[PDB]
């Protein structure tokens, strides 16, 4: 009974401290938004950002290679599991490389250094419908009413509320919904076109719902801000497009289902790749290893493999290594306690900087060891934490 009371108390404390942390994030976001919006006029922004079809140039017989690639002007739809090309234009920091474009190891060295200097980032923003606006408003108001009742019922958590506010005011550094983060380490490119893959699940492992998605590109330059301050960015958003899961439509069209016939299994991949979705050969290779007695391929297993993350990444988590992937929740918790109140947008903007700082400079506070960590909160206190040790 005492343990249950302690657990309830800890849950109430967590709720009240989160409620106290909520306004700091909003005020910091407002301040950094003001600092950002007062900056683009002085700097040079990106004038145009467009999304085009992925180039699959396989030159036929009699076709020379020096011909420039052909790309579509625009696309009104982004399939949930397809590839895309984004085109932008920027200032002199890349026209210098455009000059230097016109066979030596040191030449490639200096070209690579100039490539390293640049920095780009791509994100996706979903427009929120009014129904979702009011649906989230009612949920958040219910939660804050519940936390108010929690504060009322026990005349002790008011002190913790004020202490949390003071601690956040002493720790915090002084200064339309994010959907998924695309390639973050994208650098300045010769052709100003970047290839991106949209994953089925976002950073939090949930599918992306129906909505109008806008591609927002933010450009960084290390010459001005070497600390990667989120305020100093060149921000440009493209026109909204529709995103949906084309897999049910494609499978229904192809099959006119639970077991894909073995004979017609292979043409289905060609149909998918014609429709625009990309299916790795490894994915199909090990999808064909789980067939039934007759040879039919399990459609649900193939779909799970296709939407899985091991075979193909989103070019953002691909840059992150397995160690960073393992310690990412710890970095998330430390980031949200250092900056009281945060969300996916700011976490994605500061994603790789903090991870590289943690896994390069510190490398020891994170990267849990074998004797100071607990791998199961219900087993660590008994098995791994014997009272002798």
């Amino acid at each position: 009974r005492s343990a249950a009371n302690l657990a309830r108390a800890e849950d109430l404390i967590h709720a009240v401290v989160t409620a106290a942390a909520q306004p700091f994030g909003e005020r910091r976001r407002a301040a950094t938004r003001d600092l950002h919006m007062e900056f683009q006029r002085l700097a040079v922004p990106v004038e145009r950002v467009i999304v085009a079809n992925p180039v699959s140039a396989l030159l036929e017989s009699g076709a020379d290679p020096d011909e420039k690639p052909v790309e579509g002007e625009k696309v009104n739809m982004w399939p949930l599991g397809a590839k895309r090309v984004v085109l932008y234009k920027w200032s002199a920091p890349n026209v210098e490389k455009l000059k230097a474009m016109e066979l030596t190891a040191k030449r490639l060295r200096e070209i690579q250094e100039l490539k390293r200097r640049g920095f780009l980032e791509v994100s996706l923003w979903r427009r929120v419908t009014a129904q979702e606006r009011k649906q989230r408003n009612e949920i958040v108001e219910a939660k804050k009413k519940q936390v108010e009742e929690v504060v009322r019922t026990v005349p002790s958590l008011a002190h913790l509320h004020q202490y949390a506010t003071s601690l956040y005011s002493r720790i915090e550094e002084r200064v339309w919904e994010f959907a998924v983060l695309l390639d973050d380490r994208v650098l300045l490119n010769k052709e100003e076109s970047v290839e991106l893959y949209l994953p089925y699940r976002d950073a939090n492992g949930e599918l992306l719902a129906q909505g109008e998605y806008r591609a927002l590109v933010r450009a960084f330059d290390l010459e001005a801000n070497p600390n990667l301050h989120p305020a100093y960015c060149s921000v440009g958003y493209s026109e909204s497009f529709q995103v949906f899961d084309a897999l049910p439509q494609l499978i229904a069209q192809f099959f006119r289902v639970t077991h894909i016939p073995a004979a017609d299994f292979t043409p289905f991949c060609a149909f998918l790749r014609d429709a625009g979705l990309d299916v790795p050969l490894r994915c199909e290779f090990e999808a064909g290893q789980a067939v039934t007695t007759d040879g039919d391929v399990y459609m649900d297993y193939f779909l799970q493999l296709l939407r899985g993350e091991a075979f193909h990444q989103s070019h953002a988590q691909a840059g992150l290594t397995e160690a960073q992937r393992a310690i990412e929740p710890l970095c998330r918790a430390h980031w949200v306690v250092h900056h009281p109140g945060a969300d996916e947008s700011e976490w994605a903007t500061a994603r790789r900087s903090v991870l590289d700082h943690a896994m390069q400079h510190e490398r020891e506070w994170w990267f849990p060891n074998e004797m100071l960590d607990v791998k199961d909160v219900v087993t660590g206190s008994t098995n791994g934490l014997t009272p002798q040790m």
Binding site: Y163, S166, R170
Partner: peptide
């Protein structure tokens, strides 16, 4: 310890009657 409110600061140190009195005064005010 140092950044904590005085109620928490003195409740971590075993003084419980003083902590209760301070909490009562604070909830009164």
């Amino acid at each position: 310890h140092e950044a904590a409110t005085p109620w928490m600061q003195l409740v971590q140190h075993g003084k419980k009657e003083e902590a209760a009195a301070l909490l009562k005064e604070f909830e009164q005010k």
